Amino acid sequence: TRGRVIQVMGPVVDVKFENGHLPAIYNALKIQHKARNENEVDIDLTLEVALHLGDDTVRTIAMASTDGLIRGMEVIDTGAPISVPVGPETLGRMFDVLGEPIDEKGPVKAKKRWPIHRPPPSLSEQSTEDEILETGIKVIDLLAPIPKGGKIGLFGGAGVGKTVLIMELIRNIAYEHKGFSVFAGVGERSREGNELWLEMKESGVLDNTVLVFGQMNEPPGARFRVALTGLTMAEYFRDEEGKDVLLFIDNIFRFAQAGSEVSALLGRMPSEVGYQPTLATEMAELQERITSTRRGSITSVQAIYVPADDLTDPAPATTFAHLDATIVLSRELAEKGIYPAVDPLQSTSRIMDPRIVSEEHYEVARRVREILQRYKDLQDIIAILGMEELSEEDKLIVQRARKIQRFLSQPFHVAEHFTGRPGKYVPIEDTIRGFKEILDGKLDDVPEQAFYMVGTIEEAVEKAKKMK
Amino acid sequence: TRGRVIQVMGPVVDVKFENGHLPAIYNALKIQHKARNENEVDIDLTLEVALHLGDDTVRTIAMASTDGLIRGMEVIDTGAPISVPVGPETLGRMFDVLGEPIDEKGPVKAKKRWPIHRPPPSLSEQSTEDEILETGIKVIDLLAPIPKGGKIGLFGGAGVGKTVLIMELIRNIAYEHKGFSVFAGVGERSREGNELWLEMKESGVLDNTVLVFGQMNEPPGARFRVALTGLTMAEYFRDEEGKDVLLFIDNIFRFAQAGSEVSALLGRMPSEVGYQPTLATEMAELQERITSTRRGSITSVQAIYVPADDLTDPAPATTFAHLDATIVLSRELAEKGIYPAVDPLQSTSRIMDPRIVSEEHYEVARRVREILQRYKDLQDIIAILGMEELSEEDKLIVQRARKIQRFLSQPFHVAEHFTGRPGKYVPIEDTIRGFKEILDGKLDDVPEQAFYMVGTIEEAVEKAKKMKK
Amino acid sequence: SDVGTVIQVGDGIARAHGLDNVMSGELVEFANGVMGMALNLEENNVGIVILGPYTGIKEGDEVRRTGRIMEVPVGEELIGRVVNALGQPIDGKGPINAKEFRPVERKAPGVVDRQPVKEPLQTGIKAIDAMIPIGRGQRELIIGDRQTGKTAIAIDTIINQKGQDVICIYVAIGQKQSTVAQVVKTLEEHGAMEYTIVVAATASDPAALQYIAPYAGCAMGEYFRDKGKHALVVYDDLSKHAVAYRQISLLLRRPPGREAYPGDVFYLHSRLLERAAKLSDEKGGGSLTALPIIETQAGDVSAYIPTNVISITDGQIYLESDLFYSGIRPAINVGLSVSRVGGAAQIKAMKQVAGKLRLDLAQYRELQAFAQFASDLDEATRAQLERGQRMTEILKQPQYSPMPVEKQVVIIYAGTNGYLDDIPVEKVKEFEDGFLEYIESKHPDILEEIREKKALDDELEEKLKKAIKEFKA
Ligand SMILES: Nc1ncnc2c1ncn2[C@@H]1O[C@H](COP(=O)(O)OP(=O)(O)OP(=O)(O)O)[C@@H](O)[C@H]1O
């Protein structure tokens, strides 16, 4: 049943086997070799079967560094895909891509191991729940309400605020629901991952949480399969235990790039901007499993890196079809000091219908999006002609749009090191009441600077009093 | 002799010939197979040879669907290119790219068959007797005259009026010129081939016209060779009958896109914006065969789709070189009710010289382009400031430009059903006389509404009275 | 022999030796029981595209030719049900007892087999039915950026076919299982499932199924056309269908072209969309109309697949991300959208009022380029600006709110003849509903006459009956 290494090309390794004893696709293989003399190095490596080539040969992707491999090394077949522990024994533990523990706590000893590749729920198992998840974040709770059991996607370039926004959502939602939580950290920073683990270990929240990481510095085999390890652990709580769970992923773009790095070495023809021909199929294998069924529910918050600030790129472009809510972060807002920097004209959700939200909520959100679009359509005219040449209506529309764009700003609890302010939580009632009061012109005699970094409208009014 | 199918990949087929000899490039091949058992399907297919590969093997482009083909099927060499019927028997008939009749009227039974790939006329056989072909359309005959033996291009986006303008031109030639016409529907929408066939069968114009279509749903090899089939049928009337004939080609953009698809299928490297490297050579093989010689003349009207309003795209750009005259149709005129919707400021021809057309024709057409341009230079001031601020000269210049702008409008016979307006044909003498009388300021105390949709200028003068003014 | 064996296996693609007598496009069966299509025939191998889970196929496995072309079940029995790209049920309501089967690949009706399209396909949407008309055998494209309202126009159109003899086929290509289920509940909520067939190739399904889906939905629509009935077919996104074909063609090693797509891609959509037609009386007078949808990246209408499908269709509806956030809710660019069949598709009453609306909007588009200043514009220019702003408002309509053709005529008539001109711009939307409730509640004879004659000519009463409403409301 055993085989031998024939070629090594970076992350890709080719293996040849005996007559008719070939392993299936997605099947795991093992390399365990001890140095025979001082010119060799000890190796412990796992390979995943990618395709059949002919001449009893198979092409594979390595899960760790291929340094030290030699042509002719013996390889063993495990008979099944990468299998990871599942169950309540996995709560409060940190894991590697292969489901082995990162923490110094000891062996997990779980009762069952599940394969990383499973078919998604059929059309008859789907759910159609229309329930609003309140986040306490003034921009999302108004313009892009989060559906329970749906997918919410955070799109942004480098350093716009995706991680600061994910961590504020983790803090606010996991506080009151007390359900099981999972965080994957596919492209999560080891420094941030350490800051998260310490807070969860001291606050006790870790006892209900599963963690899988898979750092930036890892080879593409790990960056490609790590999102599926966290998802396979979150699926057990939905399928076999019937619970409602939160699944956080700091970067699904890294999962796409890891497939791109692999594709040239596999022998495939490239597509647009050098990507793999299979890009939409691979994103759907991950995203179709993240759904709520008649047994239980999976709600997910995901961050998507946008390379070179271009949303037309194949990876971000392919992802939009799968999300129930989409939040886009703009550098123009970040460079102007307005945080969380969410773009009001490109952010949307499935739930923003007159049949799912109140008449007062629908009307306020409509009036906000419209006044900001009218202000966007005038920044050229205000540049070519003096502001004293604009009509009274346009003059008021500019002042109201100016107040609104900064009243959308809020100091987060997870950002006290950057904002220099305590941090605030705002209920939906005060968000709607707040924007309605500005839109209706009751606050025309208040400076724009009073609306920046305040949680609620009553605060803006005392912030105006603190300045004669 | 006989060859065998070796590979099948979409519209592309590879054939091996072995003994005897290999077919020439552009040579037609035939596949005729009857199902040997119930697991097979009957096939009737024609292929065109494109290149030699070695190992007694040739690569070919299929003229119809390759579904049901099997490796090892026998192939026959016809010894020549695609050959189509020619002669007076081809008048009033609808044809496929291979020259087989589409209509149920029966076999054409013509006396001769000509190949689709023949050399163009030589520099010695070229004639230089330039003159004007009267269309009866008041915008073309003044601003962009058509040379006999020359090429005229109609440029525009979707819904501007290109096919209706082509249908009216086909009628007018069959009405007073009594000539023979050919229409080549290169990549034609089957909904439109039905409307062209019905207008011509009821108006009687079909008995003097040849229709070549194929279909927009056929493979790219068929969409590419169809314009040559219409041209090879138009050549016989010039060369063997010595007549003057008009060739209409609707959307050479589909011709350019079909050569691109064939080049991509054969494996050639993409050129500028993904077109074939051979674009200029292929366009020219069709445009050069259309010329006036010492035997007779072929003149041509061609429509060109402008994708996304960009005239710099390789397809429109390569076409401009072979155009004696140019017409640009503006969507802004079409939606304002002015038909045929030709832009008076972008339409031009090479024959617009005093040495080829009358001094009165040249002088009037100049005065028209000038007054229209002057009015274009003032419409900003007329909108922001009161019209009461314009000088006496400019005020009269605006009113004359306003009458001239609508006087370019004309009701077509092929479009009578849409609006109910009878349709008009205007001779060159009355087009020149009409614009001259407006430009000379003789006819000023007549309302602008009287010049919209009227034919000759006497009809505008009676219409003023019909409107009680 | 007719037995082949597998020599390579990848992402839904396999290659085999043997199969000497297989034909182009034939179905082939693997020893595991799964099926695939023989797409490429080479000197020594056959390229097979798999129609199911490929992970069970290995090098050395036996593969056999079936001697059969790909076919799907058809008939009245598919109405009010949900099926996959092969016609198999996925709604959980049991088996389908269809009596006939049709190949998904058939030739389109010829030039002589057709007749001109002269009857309307009401969408119930005032911007489409007045300015961008659809006839009962026409192909119209819905095109625009993501989240602009593309499916809403197709679903509102399917819901309006209740009191009309039209079978509706909704084909979902590369959609999430969750959005398919959300659309199916909306169709049941409005009762559209009493005449609707749903075909769905999910994003999780192999590229071969997302490729077969539009052709299967087309075969089901053709059955009704061949029997003298009317049918409507929607393709939720042709952009994902092109991407699915790009994937298979690149994995099969066919040479790429423009924007990485295969040269064969124009023939892919034209062989599909030309099957929608109105037949001649000798063929039975039946009809099939199509509504394909395309998504543009950041407004690029000049891209390969968009320009390719724009050239195939008989008209296009353009949706703007700009109009959508500005409060013009259906978000249609009326100054760019076009239908060739316009006029012929509409009824005599609708055409008359469409005309004045067209001139008013065209003039307003000319004036708005310099509408930045209005206190300086001449009072005459203001008349053009004011009329244009009001005609724009009439076109605004809430989702799932089709207006009946007689009411669309009655309101466009009022705006075009200046009866809505005197009403304030913000108050126009309120006045529209109030006037329609007034005309239906008392003296309903105006709405009854327009349904029967379809030609107006009775306006003296409509004018006098309107003055009684405007006197105090
Ligand atoms: N006429 C309308 N009035 C109000 N809201 C509308 C209208 N039409 C569509 N919407 C809203 O627009 C949003 C997007 O609609 P829809 O899903 O049909 O757009 P789409 O372009 O097809 O999106 P996608 O590309 O994701 O499929 C939905 O929230 C819908 O309710």
Ligand SMILES: Nc1ncnc2c1ncn2[C@@H]1O[C@H](COP(=O)(O)OP(=O)(O)O)[C@@H](O)[C@H]1O
């Ligand atoms: N809500 C916020 N409040 C204040 N500062 C912020 C906020 N969001 C982003 N920033 C600042 O910008 C950076 C955001 O980092 P991070 O969230 O990791 O960016 P990204 O993940 O998008 O690359 C931090 O340095 C932080 O100081």
Ligand SMILES: Nc1ncnc2c1ncn2[C@@H]1O[C@H](COP(=O)(O)OP(=O)(O)O)[C@@H](O)[C@H]1O
């Ligand atoms: N002379 C005309 N008078 C009135 N309507 C016309 C006229 N010419 C064109 N149209 C209208 O515009 C459409 C033009 O379509 P078509 O000929 O296909 O335009 P194009 O090929 O330039 O895109 C016609 O179907 C008709 O509705």
Ligand SMILES: [Mg+2]
């Ligand atoms: Mg970050």
Ligand SMILES: [Mg+2]
């Ligand atoms: Mg056209």
Ligand SMILES: [Mg+2]
């Ligand atoms: Mg959609």
